[PDB]
Ligand binder design. Sequence first.
Ligand SMILES: CC(=O)N[C@H]1[C@@H](OP(=O)(O)OP(=O)(O)OC[C@H]2O[C@@H](n3ccc(=O)[nH]c3=O)[C@H](O)[C@@H]2O)O[C@H](CO)[C@@H](O)[C@@H]1O
Ligand SMILES: CC(=O)N[C@H]1[C@@H](OP(=O)(O)OP(=O)(O)OC[C@H]2O[C@@H](n3ccc(=O)[nH]c3=O)[C@H](O)[C@@H]2O)O[C@H](CO)[C@@H](O)[C@@H]1O
Ligand SMILES: CC(=O)N[C@H]1[C@@H](OP(=O)(O)OP(=O)(O)OC[C@H]2O[C@@H](n3ccc(=O)[nH]c3=O)[C@H](O)[C@@H]2O)O[C@H](CO)[C@@H](O)[C@@H]1O
Ligand SMILES: [Cl-]
Ligand SMILES: [Cl-]
Ligand SMILES: [Cl-]
Ligand SMILES: [Cl-]
Ligand SMILES: [Cl-]
Ligand SMILES: [Cl-]
Lengths: 498, 498, 498
Amino acid sequence: IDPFTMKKIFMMVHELDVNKGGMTSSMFNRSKEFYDADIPADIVTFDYKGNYDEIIKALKKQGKMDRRTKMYNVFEYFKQISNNKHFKSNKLLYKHISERLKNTIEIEESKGISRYFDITTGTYIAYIRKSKSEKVIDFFKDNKRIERFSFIDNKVHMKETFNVDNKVCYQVFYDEKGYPYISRNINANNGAVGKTYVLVNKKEFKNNLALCVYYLEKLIKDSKDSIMICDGPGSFPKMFNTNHKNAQKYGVIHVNHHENFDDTGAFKKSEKYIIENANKINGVIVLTEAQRLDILNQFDVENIFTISNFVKIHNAPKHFQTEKIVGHISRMVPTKRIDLLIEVAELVVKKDNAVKFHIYGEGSVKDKIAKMIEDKNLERNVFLKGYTTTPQKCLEDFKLVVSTSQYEGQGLSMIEAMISKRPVVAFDIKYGPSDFIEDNKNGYLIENHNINDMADKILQLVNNDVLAAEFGSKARENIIEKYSTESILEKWLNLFNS
Amino acid sequence: IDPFTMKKIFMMVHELDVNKGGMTSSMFNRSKEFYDADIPADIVTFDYKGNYDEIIKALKKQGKMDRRTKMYNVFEYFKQISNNKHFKSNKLLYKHISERLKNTIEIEESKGISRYFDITTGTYIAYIRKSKSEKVIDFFKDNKRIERFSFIDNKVHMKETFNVDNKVCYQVFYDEKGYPYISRNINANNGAVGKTYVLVNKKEFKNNLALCVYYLEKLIKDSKDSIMICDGPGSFPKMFNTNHKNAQKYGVIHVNHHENFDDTGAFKKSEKYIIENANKINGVIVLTEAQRLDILNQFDVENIFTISNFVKIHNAPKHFQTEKIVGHISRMVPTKRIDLLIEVAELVVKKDNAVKFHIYGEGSVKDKIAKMIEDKNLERNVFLKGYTTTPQKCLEDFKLVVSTSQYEGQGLSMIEAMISKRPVVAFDIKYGPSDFIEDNKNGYLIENHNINDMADKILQLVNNDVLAAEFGSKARENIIEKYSTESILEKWLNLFNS
Amino acid sequence: IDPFTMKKIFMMVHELDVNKGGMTSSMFNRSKEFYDADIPADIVTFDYKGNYDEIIKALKKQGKMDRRTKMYNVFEYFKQISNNKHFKSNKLLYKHISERLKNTIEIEESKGISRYFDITTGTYIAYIRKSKSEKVIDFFKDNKRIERFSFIDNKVHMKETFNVDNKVCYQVFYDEKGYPYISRNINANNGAVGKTYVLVNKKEFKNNLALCVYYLEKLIKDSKDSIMICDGPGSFPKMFNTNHKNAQKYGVIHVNHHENFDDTGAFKKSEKYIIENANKINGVIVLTEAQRLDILNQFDVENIFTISNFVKIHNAPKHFQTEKIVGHISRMVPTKRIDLLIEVAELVVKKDNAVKFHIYGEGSVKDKIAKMIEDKNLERNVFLKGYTTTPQKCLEDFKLVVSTSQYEGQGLSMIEAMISKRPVVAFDIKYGPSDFIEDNKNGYLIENHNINDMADKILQLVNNDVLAAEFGSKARENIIEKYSTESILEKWLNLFNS
Ligand SMILES: CC(=O)N[C@H]1[C@@H](OP(=O)(O)OP(=O)(O)OC[C@H]2O[C@@H](n3ccc(=O)[nH]c3=O)[C@H](O)[C@@H]2O)O[C@H](CO)[C@@H](O)[C@@H]1O
Ligand SMILES: CC(=O)N[C@H]1[C@@H](OP(=O)(O)OP(=O)(O)OC[C@H]2O[C@@H](n3ccc(=O)[nH]c3=O)[C@H](O)[C@@H]2O)O[C@H](CO)[C@@H](O)[C@@H]1O
Ligand SMILES: CC(=O)N[C@H]1[C@@H](OP(=O)(O)OP(=O)(O)OC[C@H]2O[C@@H](n3ccc(=O)[nH]c3=O)[C@H](O)[C@@H]2O)O[C@H](CO)[C@@H](O)[C@@H]1O
Ligand SMILES: [Cl-]
Ligand SMILES: [Cl-]
Ligand SMILES: [Cl-]
Ligand SMILES: [Cl-]
Ligand SMILES: [Cl-]
Ligand SMILES: [Cl-]
């Protein structure tokens, strides 16, 4: 509303990075929408990367992140404090590294890889592997690795320490002048972060949780204009344990709060903790009004709200596709019951050998879908392409896309395919495509068991390229008028203004 | 006899310390008696403590140790030699510690606890925890602890070294000027002391045994006026392996030489080794003439003698106690068959709910006596108070004390209670209270099985406060005239003079 | 032929050393023969010893190695290169060792054994054990050993590094001026040599195999006059993987290519790899024309040749031996079926108690032959003397020697005994004594099962000292005229000239 509002939204996820999607791409778009309504919506991360500036720069150039959206990082905050406490490069650090490397001889392995040996004792001193903009230096003691200095543009940003099993047990972070501002213990057995020492402020913290809580109380002004939104479930404790009294906290659950493949009536451990404590924050936000009603009818909480996702209606291809191409662009995870779909490919091709499948994306169950299509020799017909950073250009050469799951928040990947004139085929599930797919109108829906009824539907479409177009043009105009943005945006503000 | 005798007794136990009793308190009193007869009786210990001066000072101020009694310590002997080899403080040591601490930043944990990090590399350097008179400094390498310097009044007395599992594998002891005089290897797996290097005399020793044998040959003049008395069974090898030809050696066995809870006819492993070699020293000393006769009738040894213990007849309360208070002040050990007594409390209270129990002292089987009285909910009635440094003031508010065992040397803890006008109740056993308890005269004795006959006897006393007094006044006057000191003292001298 | 031929033979075995025999003694003699025919035949080794000069010097003085025969060593090659790159002693190395030893105090253990402790901290610094011409210095860190410097004539030739389990994980070799020329990683778990760094030439090598291949291409001129002969089966990959195009390669198999105690028809793993690749080198050389025919009738290889061994007909004793002395001078290994011979001693002595046995040499199954003759109490009669560096002087006091095996190349140890007027007794086997023992003529042969038929034959000889002499004099004159050297030598040259 107000073009000069002091409202601001801090969206919290553990890490940002390139070549993902789903929850993050939803966060990127949500930031874009809020910025349009003159409300700054930025992102807060809590992990360390020495090249986040290069990653954020990439995410914006590659058109995945609105350029107005900033990422706040806990380590970038304390680094910048450190930067303004010193006004002289930390040469003693580079002298420390230089001194351990002198009186050594060099022996090359390959192009930018060399080892160094003391010319007096013959002792193994260092291993240096340098690219062109980054460099690592591994120091050795008693022929075991003890330390690694990491470089970016000839500058140290991290020092790692290694135990007896050659695993990290300690990290140090150096500012842009070479001064250490943060160091922390690492449990080598699981990689969990322990005690964290903020050297620049001479303060210690029990763990990363205690550090980021302290960080948010510094980053986020305790005003009712400050709004915290936690997408990732692994960041919720950070938002919940702050001593904010005025600031708002909204937990956004993205997934089904039901345990995967459990008929007990049990929930996800983390996704339930959020729900239980809904009456202590400003309310948990789901996506379907169904999932609201389920949580209503399970937990004693008077504070759940349903808000869908902003959709970006990009532009459909100039044409369609004629050749019997079916695709499944997704990340391979057992929760999607892909086992209960590739046994529809098999059920299709035998009635029509010209139907082809292009599988994109990666995952854990990729390598056993791989060693499964050749057991049946559908390598002939089915292809596991790979991860595509161009989801739409791979989408615009489909006749239709296919997907399934037993657990979803809603339809993200199915919706954005319907825009590109593509009639997707999926099951009816708990929370998802019971609303944006109208069966025998612009797409198809099947009970999540009748595995050849889906195999029946595909042949009603791929063999009818003139009917696999009207269903596509009735897809896009279906998305557009159904949820919009204003309907969704006013959901958010009325929650804010209260 | 002779007020100017050159006779001296060295009583040997591994360690002395505060808040114990039994064998040690017997040693403290025996020293007091011998000093009265103009024969110096001192104590020799073989362990290391940096605060033994403070402990001995406490033992005397707190009236547990005769002030004339000295403690000789093997490490205090070599420290004092070291003290007179140097006449200039070892500043290079404190410089060595200072240098490793400079260029560091401090980060506090609590009041006197801080960690230190190198301001150039961010490396974890040191952990310092200081009280007000003592201080520890833990140094780190590759984020693992390697060394600990221990301070007392700002002075180093010990440096410890740690292995990969963070356990001690090496110790160093510094004199009062900061010079190392003794270092030794420690087996981290069991804490056993290995090779011991006497740096001040440039001599090495296989273990602590070889070190203390050498020490006794220095400490104790090889004359017939020198008398060695080994109370602790764990110190006997130290006395036995010396090359003394004239000096006397007397091993004093305090306990039953029968294996605990074994009906085989087997003995304690250590207590038998002493017995087997009785014909090689000046004789083993037991406490009961019974235990003498048993050893006579088991081993071929013509050299066993029976001598009881000196009793200190202190002063009884001004009054008694009326309220049904029963106490067991003892150290909780399975050899005392406490299981076979707390199931007499149960057998008592049900006939008289006003009988109360106060349990003092500590032990291993305290925590399962604890979770046992509440299973039966005698928390109502039975109390595990705690260790009492005031045994008599806790004793002087009893009507009677109670105890049992299947194995004893004699009655120490039962005897000193009879002084304070208290009729104790105990079983008849191998070696013990068959002599200082006269049943139905001043106390009570039961077969060590009839667990409710004891429960019968208590009610014959606690419900008769006028009969639980005559039995008390017949207790003290019973101890006094029965064994005395002169009868016991002349036992010792006639052994000496031979 | 040509007294000025540029032909040269490099005989390759992994290591040479004192107190062995068999394959090596065969190599020593073969070098001697070839040198007589004006063809230099030298030996190449691939292991490290700091005292090989002293060992080779011993092998020649003790008359086991022809003085014209040289040993080439891969580490001696790179050391000599290193020697000529520096013209100033590496004092900084000895300064490095001196500095770590100053400010220490000495504590002796025995004659030439002492430990050193820092006089400031008391820290365990070093352990030095010196003989009179060699010395080791073990340095310690956190009371664990980390390094060992090895000395010969006050000069460092090796530095070893130790891991957490106190095992070698790194080696460094110093030239005769104290400069490191080679360092290498050691797998502590098995002692296998990994990455090898040639510091003097700044080159790295995957392992010892890659190092010695490179070494042979430097050592051995790629000419048809250069001839490589690989005796040891463990050195064959080194000869086979060189990029020699003109040089000749001859693999000499010494043993049975049949798996020990396997009736499957399976071969030795290594000895087969040689055979399989016979068509890629200049031919594999066996010893018996039988073993040739077997390999012919198993593998598809058109390139196997049979050449026997050069025999050194030394000089027989002035006399014989009368006293019933039977000997088995050998190295104790289960492949010799000694179990199937000592149960003929037993079968002999019972018919003649005066027959005695002298067993020389060592082995793995010595200690259970030991605890076997006393179970039967033939200690009376059978003796395990020990390893004899004087094989012939121990041979010249026998009436006859005895041996057996199920696997041999031929008869080495049986043949050289026949020279000294001794009728040996052995079984007929695969590849061996079916040719140099003529039964009931100068010796005896039995089927390798009839264990008392051999026991029958001995008594036909030891009880007939006038018949145990003619068989001896028919032994020596049997060896002499049968194979000679010229017959064997021309076998070699005709292989060379082709
Ligand atoms: C915002 C939201 O509701 N998220 C849902 C989503 O999370 P999740 O993050 O797993 O999103 P999905 O994997 O279901 O959707 C596919 C996503 O992967 C991206 N992609 C995939 C392959 C590829 O080659 N390139 C590419 O970019 C797509 O842009 C798309 O955004 O699925 C979960 C279950 O699986 C649901 O419970 C969550 O509710
Ligand atoms: C000198 C002697 O003969 N020692 C006997 C004693 O050794 P032990 O040293 O175990 O002596 P006991 O535990 O039997 O006697 C109790 C001792 O503990 C002290 N105490 C206990 C609790 C408390 O709160 N405060 C306190 O000071 C008492 O002063 C008393 O001296 O018991 C052994 C078996 O158990 C016997 O075989 C030994 O023969
Ligand atoms: C060149 C050759 O064909 N070598 C054969 C030999 O190798 P190997 O090297 O094992 O030779 P053997 O052990 O069979 O012969 C005994 C050797 O050991 C030496 N010795 C033994 C004891 C002693 O006290 N002093 C002493 O010097 C002898 O000099 C003799 O040379 O036996 C293998 C099986 O066992 C055969 O397959 C090999 O073919
Ligand atoms: Cl900002
Ligand atoms: Cl500055
Ligand atoms: Cl004194
Ligand atoms: Cl001095
Ligand atoms: Cl040469
Ligand atoms: Cl030089």
